[PDB]
């Protein structure tokens, strides 16, 4: 049954895309929150 | 009749295909909602 | 029903995100208030 | 989970930022309080 | 008539989906409003 | 003439589909509008 | 015309949401003004 | 209607938040007014 | 109108707040003037 | 002409929905603006 | 056209809110100015 | 316009405040001048 | 050509909406500035 | 030729269908834009 | 242009507020200077 | 060639539609900015 | 081009608003500074 | 009006102070005059 | 005019003290001149 | 401006105060000098 | 009411501070008047 | 530029206030010096 | 390639829009900063 | 061969259709982008 | 609820903060009062 | 091969469009950030 | 009333100083008159 | 200059006071010297 | 760049404001110091 | 798999953009805090 | 059979088209995401 | 990549605005501190 | 409360200061009276 | 700087004030000394 | 907790200033008191 | 982490600002206390 | 670094202001002490 | 810490003024006592 | 405590000044008494 | 230092006034002693 192997391949590819997207979004959100917190804490500390 | 047996086989195949489709939808929607909630809660927490 | 398991998985995942968000909220709010109270009391006492 | 690690990394980054803010505000607050006390006491003494 | 039962089953599935969505949205909205009110009342109290 | 009965039969049998479709839309739309207003008013109420 | 009944149901449903929102506003607003007036009048009285 | 219960939980939570806010503001205000009165009265007596 | 009750409720609290402020300010002012008059009238007579 | 009779039926139905929609908008918008004005005017007066 | 009626109702609600806000602000301003004038004239007279 | 009534009430209130301030200052000044003249004339006559 | 007529009708409705909006803005801004100036001049005079 | 008369008959039918379609669009577009501008101006009016 | 009329009305209201504030400040300053001069001249003559 | 006339007519027909759109956009935008500046300049002038 | 004309009209409206705001702020600032100078010089003269 | 009651409270207390000052000043002045007259008359007579 | 009455009362009190002091000084001077003249006359006559 | 009228009013009030002060000081100085000259001349003559 | 207890707690403390201040001022004044009377009566008697 | 005209008006008003203040202080100081010199020279002459 | 000319035309229109926006920004910011500096320096100088 | 001539004729027809379509898309997109940038720069400028 | 611990952590920290403020203000007041009494008593005694 | 040539042509066209879009985005972003920074720094400097 | 005890205690204290002052002056005066009478009686006898 | 006018006015008033004081002292000294020389010459003649 | 020209114009305007403020403050300071020195020297001269 | 290469290139571009953004934020925030601290410390020192 | 050759040729052509489409998707997505993050980071940084 | 050039240009522009803002703020702060110090020193010296 | 301890410490310090001041005033007054009595008695005795 | 010119104007004004005060004081002192010397010489020579 | 260290450093620094203030006041007070007795005792001794 | 370096640079700039502010305040306080002590000791010496 | 130059210019301006203040206070104090010593020595010598 | 150096500098300067004040008061008291003793001894010896 | 050291130092200095005060007075008194008996005894013996 | 020059100038002025006062007192004392000795010697001659 080729459909079985095709679905496994599609699910594996989707999981790989999920992993890469998670890495990218983690990097972007980390940068954004870092900048926001830096500005906020610098304004409040001074 | 062979037509009835073919119909039963097609119903079983359709159920199996719906099984893979449901699994793929679950994983993809889980990833999407996880990313959305991560961004939302991270932005609101800061 | 795969839908029943799917919705339950997202609800459990969302609860974890709320827990992580609440952990980050407390440390941020505690620092901001601690600085403001420190600046307010040191000016009143002096 | 990718999300669990990301939330913890942000909390560590936020906690690190609080340390810098406290160090900076202590230096700033000490200057304003010290000048206030210096001007107050130099006039009371005379 | 298969159409009657099919429509009724789809309507029941829709109602079940509405129930799950309502539970999830109540959880998320409760968390968000809790964080917002916590920040607001903490700022007003000090 | 069986033909005129056939045209009547489909038109008569059709109406139930519009009846059930209309009932299905109300519960689907009611959930969508219900969640939309719940998030809208709780956000402004806070 | 099920749509005529459906619109009336939504208008009745939306009216209830306004009732809950108004009850939530008055308790929150009263607490905000109550703290603000308490802080203002104690400073004036002293 | 799940929405009615959802609004009640938020209103109950909001009232709980108000009690904590009122309790906290009393302590902070009482300290500032106490210090203000202490410095004011010690100058008159001296 | 729900707002009409809210505005009347807030004004009722404000007048209640004013009474407490007036009660406290009389006690504080009376003490300050009494000490001031005691110091003034004692030095003049002695 | 079946089309001309049909077009009037849909056009008349469209006028009905606009009437019900306009009634719903007034209720929702009036509540939103009322709360916005209530929060704005209360803070200024206090 | 419902728009004109909605606008008129909104304007009436705004005027009523303005009236309540004016009453409250007159009360509060009168209280504060009375306290200030009392403490200034008592200081001057003695 | 409530502003005219508020200003008139405030001016009237300032008027009776001035009245009591004058009533108290007349008594205080009379007492002080009486003591001064008593001690001056007793010293001179004796 | 009915497109031009529709465009003109929408333009006229927009102009009417601008009229109502301008009336409401004048009322609200007048009330707010009146309250602000009343408080400012009252605090300055006393 | 019967053919040349036919297309004119269909063309004549095409003219009337467009006539009602244009009439239908204006009331729907007017309702959509009228509500959209109503929400915009009232929000900015406050 | 309703904006020009609004500006004119606001300027007129500001002028009336200026008049009321001037009257009140004249009364207050007159009373205070009268008390001060009464005390000074009574002390000097005695 | 009817194709050239058809495209030219459609291209020509788009010209005044842009004209009506541009005419309406200026009216709407001028209303929005006029209100926005009126609120901004009135607050700063006070 | 309509855009250039719209921009020029907006700039002209802004200039008129600036003129009105300048007149209002000159009036208000003159009044406040006159009151302050009156109080200061009246206190100094006595 | 609490202010009127407060003003008479101070004046009633201020009246008591004058009685206390007058009682003591007669004793002190009586002693000063008595010693002076004693020294004057014992020398002139002798 | 409170100043008129206060000054008149102060002048009347001053006149009363002047009268009492005049009586006392007449008594004292009479006694002193009498004893001195008595001593002188007895010394000379002998 | 009301400033000119206020300045004239306080100047006239001050002149009236000088009149009363001059009357009182003339009376007091006359009494004191009369007593002193009486005691000097009765001491010298005898 | 959270504020009703809060106001009373401050007033209860405020009265206590008055008791502490009145005890301290009596001690200070007793030395000031005692030293003044000691130097006054020693010089006269000696 | 309205700024130059506003500043010139403010400076002219300030200078006129200066003139009034000088006119008042001359009278007050003349009265004080006259009373002082009258008492001094009457004491020395007698 | 008409797209090249289209992109050039869009860039030119955007540049014209930037020019108009910059002119309007200069005017508005100049007016606002002028008002702010006028108020600040007028308050500081007096 | 008529086939080659037909292919060339339809190729030229397609080329001119692409030309007209390119012109239409250029003008429509230019209008849309002009309106969008007009609104954007007008909102940002004010 | 994470909010219950969050408010207690801040409220406990605020109570801790007041302790240092009360400790420092006693040290500051002790020096200011001590110097004031030292300069007062050495001047009176000498 | 027409296929590879067509694909390369589309790739080159996409690259050219990307370059032109990047240029336009650079212009728009530069203008917007320039205006934002101008307003921010002008407000902060003053 | 703390003031009642304070004045009464001081008046009692002043009485003690009067007693000591009266006691010491008799010793001093007795010496002065004693020596003067001693010298004058011996000179007249001798 | 107001200062110069005030200074010479005060100098003129001082000169008049000097003249009056000189006249009075001449009268008093004349009387005293006359009576003293009268007594001295009558005693010497005897 | 338009921004550089705008900054230069704002700086020039600020310098002009500084000049006006300097002139006004020189006038006011001269007046106040002249009055204070006049009082001081007329008090010292007598 | 071109997807992995595309994801890696996109993440690298994101990281480089983050670096440039961090540099820009550092510069801007440094300038802002520098201006704020300069104006704070200059105000405190004077 | 020619079937295998046809299938293999179609598969190879499909693979080549997939590769070309993948390259086109990579470049287009890279450009789009680059512009998106450029705008995001320039907006956040400012 | 145009992104690097765009970021560098934006950073250079931000540096230029920083320089202009620093110049303007130095000028304004210098003027304000000059006025403040002038008033303080002319009040102290005289 | 730390306020009670602070007040008690202040009162104890005041008592100590009173003791030292009493010692100094007794010794100084004793020396002064000794010198005065020495001079007086050596004058009278001889 | 205008500060140097203001300082020089204030110093010239002070020098003029000093000269006026010296003239007034020397006249007053000469008159006082002449009166004293006349009295002394009439007591001595006669 | 950085705050506990920060408060202790401020309290420790405040104690250091009190040491310098007490050292300086003793030197100043000793000079002023020493001069007063030098002038007091020299006049009494001689 | 560029944020750590940015925080360090900001703290260094703050330390430099503190040094400059300390120098300026030392100079200003030295001048003020020098003038005060000069005036006080000059008055005491004479 | 513009901050260093700004601070240096501010300190230089402060030093020049200190010099001017010293120049003025020397003259004022010299005049006051000259008048005081002139009066003292002319009263003692005569 | 510059504060300690500033305190030491002020103490040294204060010692310097104390030295000059002591020299001046020694000169003044020497001259005064010399004149008084000269007059006393010339009166006694002659 | 620094206060105890200061008071003892002042008392030690005060006792020190008394020693020189008694040293000088006996020298002056012995001279005045010595010259007095010298004039008394020689006249009586002769 | 300005203090050095000011103190030296004041000491020189004090010495000048001392010399002038010495000359005046020598003249006056010589005249008085001459008159008294002349009266004594002529009395002793007769």
Author numbering:
A (entry chain O), B (entry chain X), C (entry chain BA), D (entry chain CA), E (entry chain Y), F (entry chain FA), ...: 5 to 50
Give verbatim excerpts from the published study on this entry.
Filamentous bacteriophages package their circular, single stranded DNA genome with the major coat protein pVIII and the minor coat proteins pIII, pVII, pVI, and pIX. Here, we report the cryo-EM structure of a ~500 Å long bacteriophage M13 mini variant. The distal ends of the mini phage are sealed by two cap-like complexes composed of the minor coat proteins. We further performed local refinements of the mini phage by dividing the particle into the top, middle and bottom three segments.
To determine the structure of the inner ssDNA genome, we performed further classifications using the middle segment by searching for the orientation among the five equivalent positions. After several round of classifications, we observed a right-handed double helix structure of the DNA genome in the middle segment. The two strands are well separated and presumably correspond to the phosphate backbones of the DNA genome. However, densities for the bases are missing in the reconstructions. The pitch of the double helix structure is ~28 Å for the top two turns and is ~31 Å for the bottom two turns. The pitch is consistent with that of the A-form dsDNA, which has a pitch of ~28 Å and a diameter of ~23 Å. The segment with clear double helix structure starts from layer 8 of pVIII, ends around layer 16 of pVIII, and has a length of ~140 Å. Analysis of the asymmetric density map of the middle segment showed that K43, K44, and K48 of some pVIIIs in layers 8–16 have significant asymmetric features and are in close proximity to the densities of the ssDNA, suggesting possible direct interactions of these Lys residues with presumably the phosphate groups of the ssDNA phosphate-sugar backbone. The asymmetric conformation also indicates possible induced conformational changes of the inner surface Lys residues upon binding the ssDNA. The asymmetric interactions establish a unique relationship between the capsid and the ssDNA genome and stabilized the conformation of the ssDNA, which may have been preformed in the genome-pV complex.
